[PDB]
Enzyme design. Structure first.
Site, mmCIF file in Angstrom:
data_model
loop_
_atom_site.group_PDB
_atom_site.id
_atom_site.type_symbol
_atom_site.label_atom_id
_atom_site.label_comp_id
_atom_site.label_asym_id
_atom_site.label_seq_id
_atom_site.Cartn_x
_atom_site.Cartn_y
_atom_site.Cartn_z
ATOM 1 N N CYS A 160 0.805 -1.218 0.000
ATOM 2 C CA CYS A 160 0.000 0.000 0.000
ATOM 3 C C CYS A 160 0.839 1.269 0.000
ATOM 4 O O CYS A 160 0.319 2.336 -0.348
ATOM 5 C CB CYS A 160 -0.926 0.014 1.225
ATOM 6 S SG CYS A 160 -2.254 -1.212 1.198
ATOM 7 N N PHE A 211 -10.463 -3.070 0.083
ATOM 8 C CA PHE A 211 -9.652 -3.056 -1.128
ATOM 9 C C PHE A 211 -10.520 -2.929 -2.376
ATOM 10 O O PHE A 211 -11.608 -3.509 -2.463
ATOM 11 C CB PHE A 211 -8.801 -4.321 -1.203
ATOM 12 C CG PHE A 211 -7.552 -4.258 -0.367
ATOM 13 C CD1 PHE A 211 -6.655 -3.213 -0.516
ATOM 14 C CD2 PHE A 211 -7.279 -5.240 0.571
ATOM 15 C CE1 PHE A 211 -5.503 -3.151 0.254
ATOM 16 C CE2 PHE A 211 -6.126 -5.188 1.342
ATOM 17 C CZ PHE A 211 -5.236 -4.142 1.182
ATOM 18 N N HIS A 299 -2.760 7.982 3.567
ATOM 19 C CA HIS A 299 -3.290 6.756 2.994
ATOM 20 C C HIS A 299 -4.407 6.227 3.885
ATOM 21 O O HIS A 299 -4.164 5.945 5.067
ATOM 22 C CB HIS A 299 -2.192 5.710 2.839
ATOM 23 C CG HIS A 299 -2.675 4.415 2.270
ATOM 24 N ND1 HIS A 299 -3.029 4.271 0.947
ATOM 25 C CD2 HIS A 299 -2.876 3.207 2.849
ATOM 26 C CE1 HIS A 299 -3.426 3.029 0.734
ATOM 27 N NE2 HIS A 299 -3.344 2.363 1.871
ATOM 28 N N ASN A 332 -9.880 1.484 -0.721
ATOM 29 C CA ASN A 332 -8.426 1.346 -0.687
ATOM 30 C C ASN A 332 -7.976 0.729 -2.007
ATOM 31 O O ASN A 332 -8.265 -0.440 -2.284
ATOM 32 C CB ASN A 332 -7.984 0.489 0.500
ATOM 33 C CG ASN A 332 -6.463 0.461 0.679
ATOM 34 O OD1 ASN A 332 -5.714 1.057 -0.097
ATOM 35 N ND2 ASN A 332 -6.008 -0.232 1.716
#
Lengths: 385, 385
Positions: A160, A211, A299, A332
Site C-alpha cells: 500500500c 480493497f 493513505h 483502498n
C-alpha cells in the site's frame, strides 16, 4: 559550490499532470455483504455475514469499483473460494485489465499535459495485482506506443505504501536527467487478494471490505517550460522508514490461491506513536509551526488511523476532507489511493476557488504505509492558481 | 550553465566495492543429467535424458551452485514435479535463503568498502526467486542492521536483464543525492523455475541446464573520498530498450507451480540484428573506433549469443574471457551474472597486472537482456590500478 549542469536538471521535480481511472463495474457498500456472501457460495455462515455487515459499515466506504463481476467469478469459481488454486487465472485477468486500466489514467494525464507522448523518457509502474513477465510497464509502453528506448521501472507487490515510493523514484529520475518527463502509473485491483470468507481468518475478511480497483497517472518533470507546461505540486523531499518494533505487522504471502494477508500487530498504535516524529522531520526545512497550516494526504488504509491522527495533532476536520472523500467514493486502491487523494485535493482547491493547489496552504505532507512496517513520507509544495 | 550543488552530488556514479556469494552445495554439469532425472522421478523418459545430455554439454557450463539439495527436494516433492502446486513451499525456501545469500555478498562488499554500514543510505534489491511481502530488501535491512530510514527499492521478477536495471537505478540515486551510498544486491536462485522434465515442454528443460543460484553486491556512490574510498568503475550512461519485432519472445508465467517459461521467438537473431546499433549508440560520446579497444560484459544467458557477437564484430577471443569464465564456473544467475562478470574482470585485470580495472582499456560496455524483449546497456569507464 556550483556544478556544471551538463545533462542533469536544474530545479526540483514537479507534478505536471494527474488523472485517475476505475473499472466501470462498481459495488455500493450497502449491498456488498449480500453480494459477497452469495457469489462466494457462503450464505450459510450467518454469524460471519453479520460480522461483515458491521465491519463494512465502519469502513465509511460508499462504493468500490471492481473488475470482478458476478459473471467473471462464475467462470473462475476458484477465485471465489477462500483457498483454492487460482493464481494463473488471476494473472490472466491481470494481463487483460491492469495495463489497460493504467492506459486510461495515462491517456487523461497526457491529455492534460498537452505535450507529445514521445517526450516521455521514463515510466514508473506500481502494481500488486499481478506479477507479469514482461511486466505491465512493458504492456503499457506498447499500448500507449511510447518510445522503445524509454527507461522503465516495474515495482511488483510493494504493498500500500508504493504510492509514495513511485513519487520518491520519479523525483530522482527527473531531477538528475535534463528534459526528463516521467510517466507514473499505479494500477491496482483485488485480483490477487479477493477470496471467499473463512470463520478462521478474519484478517482476510476485513481486507475484503476495503480493497478496490483503480489507477492513477502522473507526469513528473523538472525545469518546466512554463509557456506550455503548468506545474501543480513540487516534490521537495521523499523518504522511507521502518517503524521500530513492528516486525511482521503486515505480511502478505503469495500462494497458489493468491495473496493471503496477515495483520497480527496493531497498526494504528504503531502510526500514532511515530506519526509526529516523522512528519516533524519532514517539515523541518519549512519553518511551519501550525499543523493546520499545511495540506494533508494520508493513505486511508485503516479509517481509524485517520481519526486518531486527526485528534492527536488536533487538525481542522476539513484538512482530511479529500482523504475521506476518496476513501468513501473509491475505497483502498493500494498505491493509487494517495494519488487519487492528491488529485481530489487539487480539484477541490480549484473548485472552491483557493489561492494554491494545496487548498491555500503553501506546504503539504503525503504519508502512506504498508508491509515493513514501512512508512513513505513526501514533502509537497503547492503552486499558485 | 552552472547550478547550485545544494543536496545533490557533483560527479558521476562510481562502483566503489564488489563481492559475490553462492550456496555451498554445487553440481558439476557432467553429473547433472543423472541427478536431475533421478530426483525428478523421471528416469523412464530415456530419449529426453539423452536430449538433456546433449543440451547440458553445449552450455559450456562446468558447475552450478544450488540451494536445492536432494534432501530438500525430498521433503518438497511437488517442487521436483513438472507441474504441481508448490508456490508457497518455494516461497518458504526463498524467505530462508534469498536475503541470507544476499547478506553474504553484502558483507564481503562492505568489508572491501571499509566504511561503516550506517553510511549506506539506499538499498536496491533485485530477485526473481521469490515475491515476498515485506520484500527481501526489508529482510536484508534487518539482517545487516542498516539504518531504518534507508531508501529501499525492491525489484521483483524483472528477469535476466535486471543486473543492468540495478546499475541504471543506482546511478540516479547516487548522482542526485550528496553523500549517498547505495548498496546494490542481486540475489538469485532457481526456487521458482526448478521443476521436473516434460517431453512436451522443451523450453523449460533447456532452462534447467543453465539457471543457477548466486548473489552479487556493490557499493555505488558519487564524489568518492579518495583517501578512504577506492573507485573501481564509473557508470557514465545506462539505458533500456525494447527490440523491434520481439513481442512474446521471452514470457514467464508465475503459476501455482512456480515460474514457467516460454521462449518461442529466436533470441540470438534478435540480438545479432540490433547488437551493433545499440553498442555504437552507447559508445557515441567516447570516440572509440575499435571494438577491441574496450572491455566487455555480456549476459551469458545463451552461449550462442556470445559466439555470434564475438564473430559479428570480430572481437579478440580474450575479450569475452571473464564472461565465459563466470558462465563456465557458475551458470546463469539471472541479474547477478553480469555483476559476477564485472568482478571477475576486475580480479583478472589486477591478477594479470594491467594498467586499468578494465583490462587496460579505458571504456567498456555492459549488456544484458530478458523479457520484452528488453535490452539493458551500461557504459563503463575503468580506473587506473
Amino acid at each position: 559550490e556550483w556544478v556544471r549542469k551538463a545533462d542533469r536538471a536544474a530545479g526540483p521535480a514537479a507534478v505536471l499532470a494527474m488523472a485517475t481511472a476505475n473499472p466501470s463495474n462498481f459495488y455500493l457498500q450497502s449491498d456488498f455483504p449480500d453480494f459477497y456472501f452469495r457469489v462466494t457460495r457462503s450464505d450459510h455462515m450467518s454469524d460471519l455475514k453479520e460480522k461483515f455487515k458491521r465491519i463494512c459499515k465502519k469502513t465509511t466506504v460508499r462504493k468500490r469499483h471492481m473488475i470482478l463481476t458476478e459473471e467473471i467469478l462464475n467462470k473462475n469459481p476458484a477465485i471465489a473460494d477462500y483457498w483454492s488454486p487460482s493464481l494463473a487465472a488471476r494473472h490472466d485477468l491481470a494481463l487483460a485489465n491492469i495495463p489497460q486500466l493504467g492506459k486510461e489514467a495515462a491517456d487523461k494525464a497526457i491529455k492534460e499535459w498537452g505535450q507529445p507522448k514521445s517526450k516521455i523518457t521514463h515510466l514508473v509502474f506500481c502494481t500488486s495485482a499481478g506479477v507479469l513477465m514482461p511486466g505491465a510497464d512493458y504492456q503499457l509502453t506498447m499500448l500507449l506506443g511510447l518510445n522503445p528506448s524509454i527507461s522503465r521501472l516495474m515495482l511488483h507487490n510493494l504493498g500500500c505504501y508504493a504510492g509514495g515510493t513511485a513519487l520518491r523514484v520519479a523525483k530522482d529520475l527527473a531531477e538528475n536527467n535534463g528534459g526528463a518527463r516521467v510517466l507514473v502509473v499505479c494500477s491496482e485491483a483485488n485480483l490477487l487478494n479477493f477470496r471467499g470468507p473463512s470463520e478462521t481468518h478474519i484478517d482476510a475478511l476485513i481486507t475484503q471490505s476495503l480493497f478496490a480497483d483503480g489507477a492513477a497517472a502522473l507526469i513528473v518533470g523538472s525545469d518546466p517550460d512554463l509557456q506550455t507546461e503548468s506545474p501543480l505540486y513540487e516534490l521537495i523531499s521523499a523518504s522511507q522508514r521502518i517503524l521500530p518494533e513492528s516486525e511482521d505487522a503486515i505480511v502478505g504471502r503469495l500462494t497458489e490461491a493468491g495473496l493471503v494477508p496477515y495483520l497480527p500487530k496493531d497498526i494504528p498504535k504503531l502510526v500514532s506513536t511515530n506519526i509526529r516524529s516523522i512528519l516533524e522531520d519532514a517539515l523541518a526545512p519549512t519553518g511551519v509551526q501550525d499543523w493546520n497550516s499545511i495540506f494533508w494526504i494520508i493513505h486511508p488504509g485503516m479509517p481509524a488511523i485517520l481519526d486518531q491522527t486527526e485528534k492527536l495533532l488536533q487538525l481542522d476536520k476539513e484538512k482530511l476532507k479529500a482523504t475521506r472523500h476518496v476513501l468513501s467514493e473509491f475505497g483502498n486502491m493500494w498505491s493509487a489511493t494517495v494519488l487519487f487523494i492528491l488529485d481530489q485535493l487539487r480539484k477541490g482547491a480549484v473548485a472552491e476557488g483557493k489561492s494554491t493547489t494545496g487548498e491555500g496552504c503553501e506546504w503539504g505532507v503525503l504519508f502512506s504505509f504498508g508491509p515493513g512496517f514501512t512508512v513513505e513520507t513526501v514533502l509537497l509544495r503547492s503552486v499558485a492558481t
